[PDB]
């Protein structure tokens, strides 16, 4: 078969995790849900209660 | 083999080689790694660059 699967992009902000040995393996886009924006605000992937 | 050297009104297209300095490590010295200026101690570590 044949599939292009082309998708556009928009300027947004991202919170990139920088693990050792030069890898990412996890990211969060702070434009989809308020939980992602909260994660990007305090710079943490595990948010406590409050 | 005749090498015709010219110095006409034109930008510097051909120049001589750019000899780099030695690597002075374990000493607070000035460093210039192609624009990166400043002063620091050149010491290795156990990081993994890409």
């Amino acid at each position: 078969a044949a599939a292009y699967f082309v998708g556009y992009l928009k300027p947004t902000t991202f919170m990139l995790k920088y693990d050792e040995n030069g890898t990412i393996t996890d990211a969060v886009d702070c434009s989809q849900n308020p939980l992602a924006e909260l994660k990007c605000s305090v710079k943490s992937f595990e948010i406590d209660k409050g | 083999v005749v090498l015709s050297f010219e110095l006409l009104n034109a930008p510097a297209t051909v120049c001589g080689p750019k000899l780099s300095t030695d690597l002075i490590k374990n000493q607070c010295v000035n460093f210039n790694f192609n624009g990166l200026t400043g002063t620091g101690v050149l010491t290795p570590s156990s990081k993994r660059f890409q």
Partner: peptide, 18 residues
């Protein structure tokens, strides 16, 4: 038609620690 956490590329060539 859904990019489930896809399209994350290195924005620069800078190595960063944890």
């Amino acid at each position: 038609h859904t990019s489930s956490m896809r399209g994350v590329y290195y924005p620069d060539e800078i190595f960063r620690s944890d």
